[PDB]
Design a protein around this nucleic acid. Sequence first.
RNA 1: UGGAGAGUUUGAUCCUGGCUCAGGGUGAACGCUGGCGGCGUGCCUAAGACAUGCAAGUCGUGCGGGCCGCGGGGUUUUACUCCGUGGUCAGCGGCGGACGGGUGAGUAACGCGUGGGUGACCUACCCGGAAGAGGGGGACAACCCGGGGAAACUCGGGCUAAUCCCCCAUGUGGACCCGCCCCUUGGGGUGUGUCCAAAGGGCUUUGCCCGCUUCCGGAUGGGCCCGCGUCCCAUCAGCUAGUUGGUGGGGUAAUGGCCCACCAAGGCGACGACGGGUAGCCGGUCUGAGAGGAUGGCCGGCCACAGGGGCACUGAGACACGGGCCCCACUCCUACGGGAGGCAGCAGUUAGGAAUCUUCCGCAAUGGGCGCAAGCCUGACGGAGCGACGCCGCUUGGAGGAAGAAGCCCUUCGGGGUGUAAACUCCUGAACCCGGGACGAAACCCCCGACGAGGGGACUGACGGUACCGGGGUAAUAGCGCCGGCCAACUCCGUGCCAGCAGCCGCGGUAAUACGGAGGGCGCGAGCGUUACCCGGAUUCACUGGGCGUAAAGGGCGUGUAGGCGGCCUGGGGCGUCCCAUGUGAA
Lengths: 104, 99, 83
Amino acid sequence: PKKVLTGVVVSDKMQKTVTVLVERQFPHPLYGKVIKRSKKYLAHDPEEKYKLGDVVEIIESRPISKRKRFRVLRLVESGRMDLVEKYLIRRQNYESLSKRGGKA
Amino acid sequence: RNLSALKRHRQSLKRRLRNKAKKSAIKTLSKKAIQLAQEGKAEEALKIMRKAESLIDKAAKGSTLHKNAAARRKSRLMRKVRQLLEAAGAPLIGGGLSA
Amino acid sequence: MVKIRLARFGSKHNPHYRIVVTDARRKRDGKYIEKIGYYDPRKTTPDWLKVDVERARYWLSVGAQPTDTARRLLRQAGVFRQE
RNA sequence: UGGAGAGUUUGAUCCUGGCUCAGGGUGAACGCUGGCGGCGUGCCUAAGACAUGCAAGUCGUGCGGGCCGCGGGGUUUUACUCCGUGGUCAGCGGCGGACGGGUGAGUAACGCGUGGGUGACCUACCCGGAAGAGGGGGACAACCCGGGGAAACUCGGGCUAAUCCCCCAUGUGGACCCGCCCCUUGGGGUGUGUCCAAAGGGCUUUGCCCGCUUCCGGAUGGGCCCGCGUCCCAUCAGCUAGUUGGUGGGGUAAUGGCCCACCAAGGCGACGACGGGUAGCCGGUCUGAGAGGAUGGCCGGCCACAGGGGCACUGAGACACGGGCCCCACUCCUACGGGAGGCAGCAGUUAGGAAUCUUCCGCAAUGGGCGCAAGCCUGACGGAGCGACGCCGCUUGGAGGAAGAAGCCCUUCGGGGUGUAAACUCCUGAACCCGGGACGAAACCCCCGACGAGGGGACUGACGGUACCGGGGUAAUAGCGCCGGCCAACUCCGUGCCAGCAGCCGCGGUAAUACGGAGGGCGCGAGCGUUACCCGGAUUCACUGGGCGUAAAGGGCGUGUAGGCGGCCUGGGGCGUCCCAUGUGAA
Ligand SMILES: [Mg+2]
Ligand SMILES: [Mg+2]
Ligand SMILES: [Mg+2]
Ligand SMILES: [Mg+2]
Ligand SMILES: [Mg+2]
Ligand SMILES: [Mg+2]
Ligand SMILES: [Mg+2]
Ligand SMILES: [Mg+2]
Ligand SMILES: [Mg+2]
Ligand SMILES: [Mg+2]
Ligand SMILES: [Mg+2]
Ligand SMILES: [Mg+2]
Ligand SMILES: [Mg+2]
Ligand SMILES: [Mg+2]
Ligand SMILES: [Mg+2]
Ligand SMILES: [Mg+2]
Ligand SMILES: [Mg+2]
Ligand SMILES: [Mg+2]
Ligand SMILES: [Mg+2]
Ligand SMILES: [Mg+2]
Ligand SMILES: [Mg+2]
Ligand SMILES: [Mg+2]
Ligand SMILES: [Mg+2]
Ligand SMILES: [Mg+2]
Ligand SMILES: [Mg+2]
Ligand SMILES: [Mg+2]
Ligand SMILES: [Mg+2]
Ligand SMILES: [Mg+2]
Ligand SMILES: [Mg+2]
Ligand SMILES: [Mg+2]
Ligand SMILES: [Mg+2]
Ligand SMILES: [Mg+2]
Ligand SMILES: [Mg+2]
Ligand SMILES: [Mg+2]
Ligand SMILES: [Mg+2]
Ligand SMILES: [Mg+2]
Ligand SMILES: [Mg+2]
Ligand SMILES: [Mg+2]
Ligand SMILES: [Mg+2]
Ligand SMILES: [Mg+2]
Ligand SMILES: [Mg+2]
Ligand SMILES: [Mg+2]
Ligand SMILES: [Mg+2]
Ligand SMILES: [Mg+2]
Ligand SMILES: [Mg+2]
Ligand SMILES: [Mg+2]
Ligand SMILES: [Mg+2]
Ligand SMILES: [Mg+2]
Ligand SMILES: [Mg+2]
């Protein structure tokens, strides 16, 4: 079975390609509690069909590039920029964590 | 000292030449055919195309190209030649190509 | 090619062989494809040879080649007895 | 079938808390001691340097020769010349040299583990099935002739065979373009066109054996991709320009920025990017009641590496440890021009070090390469050798033997101890001697059958005159540590805060069970101590399994970002969770 993942498109910024964000719960090996944990896949979108916010199943597939080894299989739930926004703030944060601050 | 892995060496230098030559003959023929089509010289361009198709499959006979490496080379070639007489050819001597 | 041969398994002066299928290129004692018998050349017990002609016949049918004393042992278990 | 605790803070106490011991382990080393055997095991340091020998070849049933012999021919004889046969050498050619063997330097990576994918692929030798080999032509070594170099070696000229090279044919079939059908990533059909085959050898010679060609399948081996797992530092916080994606090329067995040109401006990171440190990964090992911790040494699997750095050739496979080229560092040769090397193969030497083995025997067995076979090769391997380095088995005797020698040791001067211990009586009989003496070995092969199944026969042992069996037969090594508490075991003398001990607590300042010796006692025993390291006791990083008023520990206070967490009722989904089946979980 080619692995199939389900995720949120969080990047349209590429030609014929979408960043897909894929979460996975699971219990922590030593301490028990259920930990969320996520990873971004680059997926092949040849119609530039799928759009920011779409929730797509992504499938294992023969390599298209470095990075691109998945193709967008189908569309689950169309539109939902909460996830995109959720993800978006997470990278907004990054700005703070450095050597200075104030209004930066 | 001395082996006859020594022999194995000099045998290779022989083959290194046989291969090199066979392969030169292709490159130089295939190019010639491609350029005859950029000029739309259809009958002559195929007359070369077919010889190069040969020298390829012939290469693959022994251990020079072998395989689907000749198939690669053949395909790549026959593509460009049909696609370059899209430029008002009509394959005359009509050798290499399916109608 | 894949062989049918002996794999040395006893101890110093205590040879037991496993009769094994394996690519000819493994070490004699390394990873094998399938054990299909065993041989105790000292006949220290009543049960000193054992084959499984079914599997032995299988591997022959796909062209495993047995070493000279493997085939001897295989014959001795009537791998080849066709009557 | 599984969990023990103790000593040490005080005049005493309870608690917190660290330190230490008792237990297990070892590729060990050091000290004292040392009898036999079986089986394991043995450079932890310099992936430092290496003398010498041996370590991958084989095939005359692919081919033609040179050299040294012998024999038979053509002639009336010689000369010249033809044929056969023995040895020998390399050459051409095939297959092997990509396995086997060594090491862990690098590597934190799809390297490894685990589970998947390949409609994106390869696979020599092997097995199965289908079909085929008809003509013709060429060259290069060998050899012959010359040159050059000191040498390693090298240049030119001429001849020639082949299972070496090529051209034409045959087209089962296959490859490629275009089309069409079914499939659905490059899977399977089909039509036209084009392109593509082959090698001969041996005979117990017409018909067998060994080969060759194309295609389809199997089997084995592999490439590549993906999910998930894989150490320490955040006193490393930002990183990236083939970077990220596209189009089209190149390249490959094959996918891919793998590489290139052009275009878009992406990609990555607090779920730890980038950087630094360290490290081969796993099966497993050790420890632990478990959960954990620690580790990767023997063996097995993967990876990587072959003085250091690049590289491609040949080929089914290599970017090749005992192949090729270049650069660097060493050592050697050198006629000063130039050359030759590469033990992390087996032994062995030297250096470093606390420390790590034989320049052994054998191809008898198993296994590998080539060969039709006979066979050849095989420091793989099977054995032997050294070291108490580990494990296990075994011996230094057994039964009797005093109210109880002698010496030594205490003493309350009577005695008490060593002590049934010895002496001694009898008995057995490790060592040693004699004799027999293996298993591992039945195949290849030859005969019968049919080169099948089946039967018959012969050959072969390094270990080794060993194992073991039988006959003789001698009373035949004991050491080391400890005795204040923890911790089993106390007396005398010497010594005087000295000499010394000491794991921790503490001993010794003139009556020391703590030092040194003696007698005795305790514990182990061919061994016993020491050091070093690992887990344990350590719920002393606490998931199981801890804490923070005063013991160490609440942020000076808020705000509220990420994140963590979330009241009662109904329904859907079924991610978490649970269940059954199944595959995997090699040895
Ligand atoms: Mg050869
Ligand atoms: Mg105090
Ligand atoms: Mg006190
Ligand atoms: Mg007390
Ligand atoms: Mg030994
Ligand atoms: Mg070392
Ligand atoms: Mg030898
Ligand atoms: Mg000769
Ligand atoms: Mg020869
Ligand atoms: Mg690193
Ligand atoms: Mg994986
Ligand atoms: Mg076949
Ligand atoms: Mg010449
Ligand atoms: Mg040929
Ligand atoms: Mg032809
Ligand atoms: Mg390392
Ligand atoms: Mg514990
Ligand atoms: Mg070295
Ligand atoms: Mg190198
Ligand atoms: Mg080959
Ligand atoms: Mg090649
Ligand atoms: Mg090599
Ligand atoms: Mg390599
Ligand atoms: Mg070597
Ligand atoms: Mg060595
Ligand atoms: Mg030294
Ligand atoms: Mg040894
Ligand atoms: Mg053999
Ligand atoms: Mg050995
Ligand atoms: Mg026998
Ligand atoms: Mg033999
Ligand atoms: Mg006591
Ligand atoms: Mg005194
Ligand atoms: Mg004392
Ligand atoms: Mg003491
Ligand atoms: Mg013992
Ligand atoms: Mg603990
Ligand atoms: Mg602690
Ligand atoms: Mg807790
Ligand atoms: Mg506490
Ligand atoms: Mg205070
Ligand atoms: Mg406090
Ligand atoms: Mg406060
Ligand atoms: Mg404070
Ligand atoms: Mg919140
Ligand atoms: Mg709730
Ligand atoms: Mg929530
Ligand atoms: Mg579920
Ligand atoms: Mg299961």
